[PDB]
């Protein structure tokens, strides 16, 4: 469960991401595809090379979903309901991949938040991304 | 990759008693039932709408047999699983776009299927040898991914 | 979530296990220690010899906890609360190991339930063990 | 575990800029803060009760130096990580009883620390190369478990 401090930390860190959320989303995807090539099996229809317009556009979608989760941090199972259904039923992405993107998102935030990405904040962000991942894999079976 | 002489003989002895048709159909069918997201690769197989439909599906049964036949061939190459599975690794990566986690799931389902069939004969040591095998095969199939 | 159909399947399958539970718990431990030797890193203080009475005793405890969770399948967070506390705070077993014991419990059930371990029952049992595992790792951080 | 030529030089170039003692204390500390069950091996280290208690803990820092020192030495042997880490693998299994999942978690924390320290210089290709390293090191440390 996210603690009061975790939600303070997540809100403050995502606050500092600010207008860069979409850029960071795309960066995290690129990081994931390069670092964990098995994740590319879910995107055979995408251009997955550096500077891809598809990846840039998808990063914005991922970021917006995260912004929404932050705004509804106490009701993620509902706020992300449609997205959970999409991943469980339409995309059928193996649940193991969510930790891979979560790690890539954390790395991206680390690379952009020198003052903000303290150990406590790192812990809270990791918990938050794990919780989003849990919601997104909650309807698989 | 390090199967011991005693593990090797345990694997081969049990395998000599395996009905690869039945076990293959059962393992692939259970994969699709227990982890239904794995059905994503098989829309062309037709009716996968219920457990009974999946299990009895002729295409699931045929593919299960084929997959476990290649697994069985692999057991002749226990010291070079990566070499023997290299072609199928590339295929599943580049042509089929199959996440290698699927191989790991199938391995564990195959272990359940063997336990179900053999009962007490699938002893803890025999299981442990088979765990080394299914891990090795899954790893070998994942090895050429890029 | 465990569906009403899952709960039906779990209760019937565990009903069939009956007084063999304790034995099956110990068997699943033995299977875990052999198949997944990294799990033995949590038991260096145990006697792991063949037929170990300590392992047998422990298997009974594990089984009794599962029997209780089945009996309280509509409210497992509360039924397993003290046990969740114990794993999160005292034992501190890495969450990754719960899937390994869960698999070994499934294999044990398969080896002892020829008639009952149908594909649908297998699915429900797997979900049930994952749900137990979820509760037992819920307080880790 | 196969790094390309450009990946090997990227790893080496970045590591030349790393203060190993510092980064090691930071990575071990972050491991114990982010995944607090990992504190289970360090009862003798004293106060681990808050993020600051962990991060500034002199024993945590001292241990992080030795851990990352061994890691750093291993970067000179990327083609033989299993050999390099064999005695440490045996030690962590037989004497220290450390679940190898801890090596995986530390790898990922280390990647986060490198990103935090280097900012934009920790590019997606540099990360990809370090992900190969950290996976290879964790697999090597796991390899002699039994
Ligand atoms: C933090 C975790 C994740 C978040 C917040 C997220 C969010 C999203 C969003 C907002 C969409 C667009 C939905 C729409 O079209 O309405 C999407 C689509 C998609 N996602 Fe996820 N996602 C996550 C994890 C993953 C992972 C780990 C994978 C696979 C490695 C994945 C694979 C896909 C695929 C294949 C699509 C469809 C792309 C297309 O063909 O249009 N997602 N995701
Ligand atoms: C289905 C999942 C599990 C269940 C139901 C379960 C249940 C239990 C129970 C009932 C106890 C005794 C608690 C007491 O004395 O009050 C216990 C203790 C313990 N468990 Fe778990 N457990 C599970 C998973 C695991 C896993 C995966 C591991 C590690 C591989 C583990 C390691 C331990 C250890 C080390 C103890 C303490 C043993 C001792 O020194 O007495 N458990 N567990
Ligand atoms: C859940 C997905 C999935 C898994 C776990 C899986 C697991 C495995 C394992 C693991 C032990 C082995 C040895 C294996 C072997 C094979 N697979 Ni896999 N395959 C999978 C999805 C496929 C798909 C999809 C095809 C093509 C099917 C078809 O008939 O078109 C396939 C095709 C094959 C073929 C046929 C290749 C050819 O055309 O010459 C072989 C052999 N395989 N597959
Ligand atoms: C969280 C657990 C944990 C992790 C992730 C970890 C990860 C690593 C990695 C990973 C890159 C390396 C190279 C490594 C190297 C070392 N460890 Ni690890 N160790 C761990 C727990 C220990 C423990 C416990 C000791 C003994 C500490 C003590 O009290 O002396 C240890 C001791 C060492 C020693 C000293 C050996 C001796 O005392 O003879 C080295 C070197 N290591 N450890």
Question: Has C112 been labeled as part of a binding site?
Answer: no
Query: DSSP readout, B15-60?
Result: HTT--HHHHHHHHHHHHHHHSGGGGGG-GGG---SSHHHHHH-HHH
Report the length, in residues, of chain C: 141
**Rounded distance from Cα B95 to ligand 3 centre (Å):** 11
Q: Which domains does chain D have, with CATH numbers?
A: 1-146 (1.10.490.10)
Q: What is the DSSP letter of B79?
A: T
Q: Is B146 annotated as a binding residue?
A: no
Nearest CA of chain D to the CA of A122: how many Å?
7
Backbone torsions φ then ψ of D143, nearest 5 degrees: -70, -30
Determine contact, residues D137/D89, Cβ cutoff 8 Å.
no
Please state, in angstroms and rounded to a whole number, the distance separating the CA atoms of residues C128 and C6: 8
The dihedrals phi and psi of D15, each to the nearest 5 degrees, come to: -65, -30
Asked if A44's CB is within 8 angstroms of B37's CB, the reply is: no
Centroid of chain to Cα D69: 9
Experimental method: X-ray
For D98, phi then psi, to 5°, come to: -100, 115
B130 lines ligand 3 (CB under 6 A): no
For residue A62 the two structure tokens come to 């991922």
Q: Which residue do the tokens 């899952």 mark? A: C6
d(CA B98, CA B96) in angstroms, rounded, equals: 5
In a mutational test of the B interface, the residue from A33, A41, A95 whose CB has the highest number of chain B CBs within 10 Å is: A41
> At a CB cut-off of 8 Å and minimum separation 6, what does D57 contact?
D29, D45, D46, D47, D48
Q: Is C127 helix (H, G, I), strand (E, B) or coil?
A: helix
CB of C104 closer than 8 Å to CB of C55? no
The answer to whether the CB of A12 falls within 8 A of the CB of A120 is no
Ligand 2 contact via C97 beta carbon (within 6 Å): yes
Distances (CA, A) of A113 to A63, B54, D117: 16, 49, 10
In eight-state DSSP terms, residue B144 is T
Indicate the burial class of A8 (C-beta count within 10 angstroms; 0-12, 13-18, 19 or more): middle
- Here the tokens at position C64 are 């009794």
C-alpha span between D122 and D116 (Å, rounded): 8
> Which residues neighbour B66 within 8 Å (Cβ) at sequence distance 6 or greater?
B24
Distance CA A66, CA B25 (A): 41
State whether the Cα torsion D28-D130-D18-A30 is positive or negative: negative
Q: Could you tell me which of C97, C84, C108 has the C-alpha nearest to residue C43?
A: C97
- The 10 Å Cβ neighbour count of residue D69 is 13
Q: Identify the residue whose tokens are 């209780």.
A: C68
Subunits next to B (3 or more Cβ pairs <8 Å) are A, C
Buried b (16+ CB within 10 A) or exposed e, C98-114: bebbbbbbbbbbbbbbe
Nearest to D111 by CA among D14, D4, D16, D3: D14
Q: Which residues contact D90 (CB under 8 A, 6 or more apart)?
A: D144
Give the total residue count for chain D: 146
* A49 CB-contact burial (10 Å; exposed 0-12 / middle 13-18 / buried 19+): exposed
Cβ–Cβ contact A2 with C under 8 A: no
Assign domain C1-141 one CATH number from 3.40.50.720, 3.30.70.980, 1.10.490.10, 3.40.50.1010: 1.10.490.10
* Contact predicate A72/A78, CB 8 Å: yes
Burial class (CB in 10 A: 0-12, 13-18, 19+), C46: middle
Place of tokens 């081969």: B12
**Got the DSSP string for D15-32?**
HHT--HHHHHHHHHHHHH
Please check whether residue D132 is in contact with residue D126, taking contact to mean a CB–CB distance below 8 angstroms: no
Candidate from C35, C36, C123 with C-beta closest to B33: C123
Give the other-Cβ count within 10 Å of A130's Cβ. 15
Q: What is the DSSP letter of C89?
A: I
With a 6 Å cutoff on the Cβ, whether D66 touches ligand 4 is: yes
Residue nearest to atom 40 of ligand 4 (CA): D67
Contacts of D115 (CB under 8 A, 6+ apart): A107, A108, A110, A111, D122, D127
In contact, B103 and B142? CB cutoff 8 Å:
yes
Count of CB atoms situated within 10 Å of the CB of B9: 12
- Please check whether residue D20 is in contact with residue D72, taking contact to mean a CB–CB distance below 8 angstroms: yes
Residue D97: phi and psi, rounded to 5, are 50, 50
**Cα distances (Å, whole numbers) of residue D5 to D10, D123, D129:** 9, 17, 10
Give SS3 for B3. coil
Give the integer Cα–Cα distance in Å for A140 and A94.
9
Resolution given for this structure, in angstroms:
1.5
Nearest to D20 by CA among D100, D117, D99, D105: D117
Residue nearest to atom 16 of ligand 1 (CA): A83
Return the axis-axis angle of helices D20-34 and D58-74, rounded to nearest 10°: 120
Closest to C68 (Cα-Cα) out of C132, C116, C113 = C132
Q: Is C136 within 8 Å of C76 (Cβ atoms)?
A: no
Please choose, from the candidates B122, B121, B3, B134, the residue with its C-alpha nearest in 3D space to the C-alpha of residue B67: B134
Facing residue for C31 by CB, picked from B29, B51, B124:
B124
Give D51-120 as a DSSP string.
HHHHHT-HHHHHHHHHHHHHHHHHTT-TT-HHHHTHHHHHHHHHTS---THHHHHHHHHHHHHHHHHHGG
The C-alpha atoms of residue C127 and residue B64 are separated, in whole angstroms, by 23
CA of B92 to the centre of ligand 3 (A): 7
Looking up tokens 């070994």 gives C104
CB B42 within 8 A of CB B32: yes
Q: Following CA atoms C140, C10, C74, A127 in sequence, which dihedral angle do they give, to the nearest 10 degrees?
A: 20
Residue D5: count of CB within 10 angstroms of its CB: 7
């Amino acid at each position: 469960v996210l603690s009061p401090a975790d939600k303070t930390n997540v809100k403050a860190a995502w606050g500092k991401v600010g207008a860069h959320a979409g850029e960071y989303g795309a960066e995290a995807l690129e990081r994931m595809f390069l670092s964990f090539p098995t994740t590319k099996t879910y995107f055979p229809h995408f251009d997955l090379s550096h500077g891809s317009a598809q990846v840039k556009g998808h990063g914005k979608k991922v970021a917006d979903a995260l912004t929404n989760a932050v705004a509804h941090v106490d009701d993620m199972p509902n706020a992300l309901s449609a997205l959970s259904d999409l991943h469980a039923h339409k995309l059928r992405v193996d649940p193991v991949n969510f930790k891979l993107l979560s790690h890539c998102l954390l790395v991206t935030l680390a690379a952009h938040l020198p003052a903000e990405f303290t150990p406590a904040v790192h812990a809270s962000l990791d918990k938050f991304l794990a919780s989003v991942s849990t919601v997104l894999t909650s309807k698989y079976r | 990759v390090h199967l011991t002489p005693e593990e090797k003989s345990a694997v081969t002895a049990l395998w000599g008693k395996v009905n690869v048709d039945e076990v293959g159909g059962e393992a692939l069918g259970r994969l699709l039932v227990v982890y239904p997201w794995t059905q994503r690769f098989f829309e062309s197989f037709g009716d996968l709408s219920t457990p009974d439909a999946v299990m009895g599906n002729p295409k699931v049964k045929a593919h299960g047999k084929k997959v476990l036949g290649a697994f069985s061939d692999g057991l002749a190459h226990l010291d070079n699983l990566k070499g023997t599975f290299a072609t199928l690794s590339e295929l599943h990566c580049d042509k089929l776009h199959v996440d290698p986690e699927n191989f790991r799931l199938l391995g564990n389902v195959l272990v359940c299927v063997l336990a179900h069939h053999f009962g007490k004969e699938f002893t803890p040591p025999v299981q442990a040898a088979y765990q080394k095998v299914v891990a090795g095969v899954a790893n070998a199939l994942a090895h050429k991914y890029h």
